[PDB]
Amino acid sequence: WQENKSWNAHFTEHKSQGVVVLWNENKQQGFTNNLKRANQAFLPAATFKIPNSLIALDLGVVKDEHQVFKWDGQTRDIATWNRDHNLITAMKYSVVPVYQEFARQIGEARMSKMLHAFDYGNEDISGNVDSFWLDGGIRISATEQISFLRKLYHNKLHVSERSQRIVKQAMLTEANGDYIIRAKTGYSTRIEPKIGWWVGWVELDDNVWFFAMNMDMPTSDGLGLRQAITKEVLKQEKIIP
C-alpha cells in the first residue's frame, strides 16, 4: 500500500473531498490519496447491488439476466424506474424497488449467512432486510470493496462460477479498444454523511486495476463527479488515455 497525496488535486479542483483507491493486480500494490479514508466504512447504497445480485442468482431468486421483473405500477421519482427491467437494466439504472423484492425473497437468514460467507464489510444486516444497505447497519470501506471485488474477479466468492460471471457481465459500464470498465455507482442519502460511490475495475490487455472511490455528496449535482474524478486519477496514472 502507498499513499499518493497528489490525487487530492482532482478532488480540490472541484471543491470536493473523498478517497480513490487503486489496486494493481499484477504488482499486488495499492494506492490511495488518503489511507485513513480508504479504510473508513460507510453505507454501500447501490454498490450493494453487486452482492445482492450474486445471492439472488445463486438462490434462484433470479433465474438469469433475461428474466423480466415487471414494474409494480407505483410511479416513483426516477423515470427509468417506472418500467419493466431485467438484471442488466436494474443494475444499470440502480432500480431499488427491483432489488428490494430480491432481498425480501432471499430473506434475512440467507442474506446474513451469505454476507458472512462473502466476508463483506461488517457483515451486518440490521434494519429491514429490504433496506439495510440504505438505512441499516451494514458498513463497508473502500479497501473492503476492493477485497470483495478481487474475489469476484477471480471467481473466488462462495457462490457458483456462473453467478459470478453473470454479475460481472451486469457490471459492464464502458468499453472500447483501450479499456473495459466493470463497475457500480452508489449514492447514500438516508444517513449522514451523504456520499457517492464508484467501485469496480478496469481491464486492460495485460493487467487489471481495481478501484473504489467515495466522496462527500451534499447534493445530487455532484453525482457526475464520481466518474469524472476517478477517470482523472486513472488518466494521470496512465491507466486510460
Q: Which residue is listed with cell 457490471? A: 171
Partners of residue 23 on adjacent β-strands: 30, 210
Residue 12 near residue 153, CB atoms below 8 Å: no
Partner from Na ion, Cl ion, a second copy, none binding residue 192, C-beta < 5-8 Å depending on class:
none
> Which one among 173, 191, 236, 237 touches a second copy, defined by CB under 8 A?
173
Residue 180 within binding range of a second copy, rule CB under 8 A: yes
> Which one among 36, 176, 221, 238 touches a second copy, defined by CB under 8 A?
176
Summarize as ranges the residues that interact with Cl ion (CB under 5 A): 169, 172
Residue 79 within binding range of a second copy, rule CB under 8 A: no
Residue 36, classified by CB atoms within 10 Å of its CB into exposed (0-12), middle (13-18) or buried (19+), is exposed
Choice between 34 and 53, CB closer to a second copy: 53
How far apart are the C-alpha atoms of 76 and 72, rounded to whole Å? 10
Chain positions 148 to 167 lying near Na ion, rule: CB under 5 A, are 155, 161
Partner from Na ion, Cl ion, a second copy, none binding residue 191, C-beta < 5-8 Å depending on class:
none
C-beta of 165: minimal distance to a second copy in Å?
A: 5
Residue 178 near residue 158, CB atoms below 8 Å: no
Angle at 55 between CA 135 and CA 98, to 5 degrees: 55
Partners of residue 211 on adjacent β-strands: 22, 200
Residue 75 within binding range of a second copy, rule CB under 8 A: no
Concatenate the DSSP letters of all residues of 167-212 into one string. HHHHTEEEE-SS-EEEEEEEEE-SSSSPEEEEEEEEE-SS-EEEEE
> Which one among 10, 37, 92, 184 touches a second copy, defined by CB under 8 A?
92
> Which one among 41, 172, 191, 228 touches a second copy, defined by CB under 8 A?
172
The residues binding a second copy (CB under 8 A) are: 88-89, 92, 161-162, 165-166, 168-169, 172-176, 180, 205-206
The residues binding Na ion (CB under 5 A) are: 39-41, 155, 161
